[PDB]
Amino acid sequence: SIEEQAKTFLDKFNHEAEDLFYQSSLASWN
């Protein structure tokens, strides 16, 4: 039930988290 909701919440969140972290890493490297 709610476990699936949490799982899909994390599935949505991980892509944006990776994108933001990658942008921050690129900025720091530059």
UniProtKB/Swiss-Prot annotation:
Effect on the protein of changing K12D: Abolishes interaction with SARS-CoV spike glycoprotein
Positions of the UniProt region annotated as Interaction with SARS-CoV spike glycoprotein: 11-22
Consequence of substituting F21D: Increases slightly the interaction with RBD domain of SARS-CoV-2 spike protein
Post-translational note: Proteolytic cleavage by ADAM17 generates a secreted form. Also cleaved by serine proteases: TMPRSS2, TMPRSS11D and HPN/TMPRSS1.
Superkingdom classification of source: Eukaryota
Outcome recorded upon mutating Y22A: Strongly inhibits interaction with SARS-CoV spike glycoprotein
Location within or outside the cell: Cell membrane; Cytoplasm; Cell projection, Cilium; Apical cell membrane
Tissue expression as described in the entry: Expressed in endothelial cells from small and large arteries, and in arterial smooth muscle cells (at protein level). Expressed in enterocytes of the small intestine, Leydig cells and Sertoli cells (at protein level). Expressed in the renal proximal tubule and the small intestine (at protein level). Expressed in heart, kidney, testis, and gastrointestinal system (at protein level). In lung, expressed at low levels in some alveolar type 2 cells, the expression seems to be individual-specific (at protein level). Expressed in nasal epithelial cells (at protein level).
Effect of Q23L: Increases slightly the interaction with RBD domain of SARS-CoV-2 spike protein
Induction: Up-regulated in failing heart. Expression is induced by IFNA and IFNG. Exposure to cigarette smoke increases expression in lungs. Expression is decreased in nasal and bronchial epithelium of individuals with allergy after allergen challenge. IL13 stimulation decreases expression in nasal and bronchial epithelium.
Record's description of how this protein is used: An engeneered stable, dimeric and secreted receptor with combined mutations that increase the affinity for human coronavirus SARS-CoV-2 spike protein shows potent SARS-CoV and SARS-CoV-2 neutralization in vitro.
Domain-related comment: The extracellular region of the ACE2 enzyme is composed of two domains. The first is a zinc metallopeptidase domain (residues 19-611). The second domain is located at the C-terminus (residues 612-740) and is 48% identical to human collectrin. The cytoplasmic tail contains several linear motifs such as LIR, PDZ-binding, PTB and endocytic sorting signal motifs that would allow interaction with proteins that mediate endocytic trafficking and autophagy.
Oligomer and partners: Homodimer. Interacts with the catalytically active form of TMPRSS2. Interacts with SLC6A19; this interaction is essential for expression and function of SLC6A19 in intestine. Interacts with ITGA5:ITGB1. Interacts (via PDZ-binding motif) with NHERF1 (via PDZ domains); the interaction may enhance ACE2 membrane residence.
Biological role: Essential counter-regulatory carboxypeptidase of the renin-angiotensin hormone system that is a critical regulator of blood volume, systemic vascular resistance, and thus cardiovascular homeostasis. Converts angiotensin I to angiotensin 1-9, a nine-amino acid peptide with anti-hypertrophic effects in cardiomyocytes, and angiotensin II to angiotensin 1-7, which then acts as a beneficial vasodilator and anti-proliferation agent, counterbalancing the actions of the vasoconstrictor angiotensin II.
Similarity section: Belongs to the peptidase M2 family.
Name of the featured protein: Angiotensin-converting enzyme 2
Organism lineage string: Eukaryota, Metazoa, Chordata, Craniata, Vertebrata
Full-sequence portion shown in this chain: 20 to 49 of 805
